[PDB]
Design an enzyme around this catalytic site. Structure first.
Site, PDB file in Angstrom:
ATOM      1  N   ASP A   1       0.804  -1.140   0.060  1.00  0.00           N
ATOM      2  CA  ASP A   1       0.012   0.002  -0.039  1.00  0.00           C
ATOM      3  C   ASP A   1       0.981   1.248  -0.083  1.00  0.00           C
ATOM      4  O   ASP A   1       1.441   1.757   0.993  1.00  0.00           O
ATOM      5  CB  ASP A   1      -0.836   0.030   1.365  1.00  0.00           C
ATOM      6  CG  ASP A   1      -1.723   1.349   1.466  1.00  0.00           C
ATOM      7  OD1 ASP A   1      -2.051   1.945   0.281  1.00  0.00           O
ATOM      8  OD2 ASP A   1      -2.484   1.164   2.410  1.00  0.00           O
TER       9      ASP A   1
ATOM     10  N   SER B   1       0.374  15.283 -12.666  1.00  0.00           N
ATOM     11  CA  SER B   1       0.081  14.863 -13.973  1.00  0.00           C
ATOM     12  C   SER B   1      -0.096  16.189 -14.725  1.00  0.00           C
ATOM     13  O   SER B   1      -0.519  17.300 -14.316  1.00  0.00           O
ATOM     14  CB  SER B   1      -1.122  14.014 -14.009  1.00  0.00           C
ATOM     15  OG  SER B   1      -1.474  13.620 -15.361  1.00  0.00           O
TER      16      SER B   1
END
Length: 330
Positions: free
Chosen positions: A35, A199
């Site tokens: 995780d 991004s």
């Protein structure tokens, strides 16, 4: 040193991935959910409330000759999806894919919430975010990666998640045969304790690329891709019959539809998520309404590049003094 371990989807939808981890002496092998969105290594154990264990493999520290109670230490974690767990703490030897850490904090669950009990395939979590998020009190503990870092050939790990197939987590090296083209690296902010990056934009199907900064986290522990409502609306507008359902809890679409791809930018590079990867199947058994793999982050507070996005790439988690993230197509 290096390590390399296969990670396997827990079900036919790739809802999560499990990786075998050896704990203690003699080894007790538990299948953990790696995780990158949290920083605790916790396990179902001989201390877990019996009614809250339903088929998981448990760690029994009393059977490990290397286990030591970390005196006074407790932990309690609440995840972004409302699940939680808590307990006490041992140190023990932990090995992943041949890479061994001694004195790793192994957080033994006394209590877990219902969603953990109901996932018989997941014996615990192995956090890979930054150690500043670790919940052990009164002395915060280091992640497996942080403990292993100095011994690794290179201070990196990589996530190569499969679509409906096994994949690989590597520690300490970059397998140059595992991806195509080059790896594009991008800056990371550790200010929130996550692998947080920006991004450079997106495209829907064969549409034109929209240049726009999208801050979010690379989270292997989140199944789906959570993006701003504007982006998600633009995606689902290209799927006939798709709609956001308040009763279901997100965008749904007709199971008869063919979904368009979704592209996200990493610097000047582009990662293409095939349309199939965005299909999470019937909302309930036998339904012709299917759940979408791209959902709005509007109610979260952060955008999340979960498994839907990450499984389309070979992803480098570079834990150098200034961390960075790398993405390659594969």
């Amino acid at each position: 040193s290096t390590g390399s371990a296969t990670t396997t989807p827990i079900d036919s939808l790739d809802d999560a991935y499990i990786t075998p981890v050896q704990i203690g002496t003699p080894a007790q092998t538990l299948n953990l959910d790696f995780d990158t969105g949290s920083s605790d290594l916790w396990v179902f154990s001989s201390e877990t409330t019996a009614s809250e264990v339903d088929g998981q493999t448990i760690y029994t520290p009393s059977k490990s000759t290397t286990a030591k109670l970390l005196s006074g230490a407790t932990w309690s974690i609440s995840y972004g999806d409302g699940s939680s767990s808590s307990g006490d703490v041992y140190t023990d030897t932990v090995s992943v894919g041949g890479l061994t850490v001694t004195g790793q904090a192994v957080e033994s669950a006394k209590k877990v919430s219902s969603s953990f009990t109901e996932d018989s395939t997941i014996d615990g979590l192995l956090g890979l975010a930054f150690s500043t998020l670790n919940t052990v009190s009164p002395t915060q503990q280091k992640t497996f990666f942080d403990n292993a870092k100095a011994s690794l050939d290179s201070p990196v790990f990589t996530a190569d998640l499969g679509y409906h197939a096994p994949g690989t987590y590597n520690f300490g090296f970059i397998d140059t045969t595992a991806y195509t083209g080059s790896i594009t690296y991008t800056a990371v902010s550790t200010k929130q304790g996550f692998w947080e990056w920006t991004s450079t934009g997106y495209a829907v199907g064969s549409g034109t690329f929209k240049s726009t900064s999208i801050d979010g986290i690379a989270d292997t522990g989140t199944t789906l891709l959570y993006l701003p409502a504007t982006v998600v609306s633009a995606y689902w507008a290209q799927v006939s019959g798709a709609k956001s359902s308040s009763s279901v809890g997100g965008y749904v679409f007709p199971c008869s539809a063919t979904l368009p791809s979704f592209t996200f930018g990493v610097g000047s590079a582009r990662i293409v998520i095939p349309g199939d990867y965005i299909d999470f199947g019937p909302i309930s058994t036998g339904s012709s309404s299917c759940f979408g793999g791209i959902q709005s982050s509007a109610g979260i507070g952060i955008n999340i590049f979960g498994d839907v996005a990450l499984k389309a790439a070979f992803v480098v988690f570079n834990g150098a003094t200034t961390p960075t993230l790398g993405f390659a197509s594969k």
